[PDB]
């Protein structure tokens, strides 16, 4: 939301100094002259910058800062002196930074100078190349700092590389003149023997390594995984790396960004990846709800190649319909709250299917109308208004 708004119009400036922001058509000196979208993005950027301050100075020290502010205010709140002490209930920026420096011993003045006083987000364009001879991974990260909303980042940058030997984090120092970052790569001895490949968490899984390159061990790369800067990343992986990142990652933002990047690769391996995500309980439900729409877009792009039925129809009849009647939907029992959301989002994406003539097929429209006719809600303890409203959608 904030990178869309700041690249759209100028930027949000937390803590201005009194104009400080002249790129935008109102004055930021008073709350009653702000645009309402600017007020919303102001609150949004403020809580993300506080998450960044928690990233630099750990969460228990952050809660100690907040407790110190509240305790000064509550010792202030019981005095009777007319504001000799009632102004300890008012916080400022300098007092907040001083309380942070009191509890932690680190000051955050570079982070405050970059993300508060400066009003911009950063844009990262990354591309990699694997050097087989020296066994290194040559990243190439360049910033677009000449756009109207952007600024230049010179700090450190975390990158997480999943190779066959596991998941390794690397810190890169991205100075102004930097372009190529050579990080080292590990072995490929988990392709010699079939062993399980260890993940970002402590677990390990069986991966189908037939799509991987023979010479490179690395399975996927993520630039800034923890969202530790206010950034927009445009990484150029290979399509099998996006499919491996969609399947076997233990991070929902990486699964979402792989869904978002698989729309450019309409190959049938990506259709298999999104269909395996859709069938998979123990995936987070908002990833499957995105995989519905991604599968609809991919299915629209590979017409005159699609083999069987329309996308997600057989999967809908496998998950939510009767075993004896495929075209009759099961009676509504909405007590699971994840297959309820997936059931009410799957025909909405299924209706974006189009034939070679650019018209929605009469197999999906008939399916949606049979979902509407055979709807029986006399048996669940929950209402049907949102599911029926999504059927109209």
């Amino acid at each position: 939301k904030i990178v869309a708004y700041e690249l759209k119009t100028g930027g949000v400036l937390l803590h201005p100094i009194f104009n400080p922001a002249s790129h935008l058509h109102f004055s930021i000196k008073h709350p009653h002259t702000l645009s309402w979208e600017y007020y919303s993005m102001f609150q949004c950027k403020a809580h993300l910058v506080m998450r960044l301050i928690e990233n630099r100075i750990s969460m228990e020290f952050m809660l100690q800062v907040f407790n110190k502010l509240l305790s000064l205010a509550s010792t202030a709140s019981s005095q009777k002196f007319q504001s000799h002490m009632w102004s300890q209930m008012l916080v400022s920026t300098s007092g907040f930074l001083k309380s942070i420096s009191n509890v932690s011993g680190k000051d955050i003045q570079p982070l405050i100078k970059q993300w508060v006083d400066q009003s911009g987000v950063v844009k990262f364009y990354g591309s990699f190349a694997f050097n087989r001879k020296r066994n290194v991974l040559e990243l190439e990260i360049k910033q677009d700092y000449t756009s109207p909303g952007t600024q230049k980042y010179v700090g450190p940058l975390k990158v997480t590389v999943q190779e066959l030997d596991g998941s390794f984090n690397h810190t890169l120092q991205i100075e102004e003149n930097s372009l190529k970052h050579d990080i080292p790569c590990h072995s490929k001895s988990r392709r010699n023997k079939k062993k399980k490949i260890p993940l970002m968490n402590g677990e390990e899984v069986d991966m189908d390594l037939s799509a991987m390159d023979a010479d490179s061990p690395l399975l996927w790369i993520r630039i800034d995984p923890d969202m530790s800067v206010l950034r927009k990343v445009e990484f150029e992986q290979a399509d099998f790396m996006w499919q491996y990142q969609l399947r076997y990652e233990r991070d929902v933002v990486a699964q979402q960004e792989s869904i978002l990047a698989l729309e450019k690769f309409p190959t049938p391996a990506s259709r298999l990846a999104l269909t395996d995500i859709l069938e998979q309980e123990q995936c987070f439900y908002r990833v499957r709800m995105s995989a519905c729409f991604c599968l609809a877009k991919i299915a629209n792009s590979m017409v005159s190649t699609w083999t069987g039925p329309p996308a997600m129809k057989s999967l809908f009849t496998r998950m939510f319909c009767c075993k004896s009647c495929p075209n009759i939907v099961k009676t509504n029992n909405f007590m699971s709250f994840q297959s309820y959301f997936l059931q009410k989002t799957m025909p909405v994406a299924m209706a974006l299917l189009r034939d070679v003539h650019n018209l929605c097929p009469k197999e999906v429209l008939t399916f949606i109308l049979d979902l509407i006719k055979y709807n029986d809600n006399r048996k669940n303890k929950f209402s049907d208004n949102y599911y029926r409203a999504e059927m109209i959608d």
Partner: protein, 52 residues
């Protein structure tokens, strides 16, 4: 044994889940269509098309 013995018969029962779902669905759709057409005809009405 039409002459000394006898036994009763019953009507053919339709215990099929498919046709029972179809019967309940079509009866609900027909009664709600009849209700909404009756309530739109005996009151103030709007129309998506001109004089419809």
């Amino acid at each position: 044994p039409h002459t000394y013995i006898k036994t009763p018969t019953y009507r053919e029962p339709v215990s099929d889940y498919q046709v029972l779902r179809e019967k309940a669905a079509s009866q609900r759709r027909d009664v709600e269509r009849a209700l909404t057409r009756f309530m739109a005809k005996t009151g103030e009405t709007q129309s998506l098309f001109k004089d419809d």
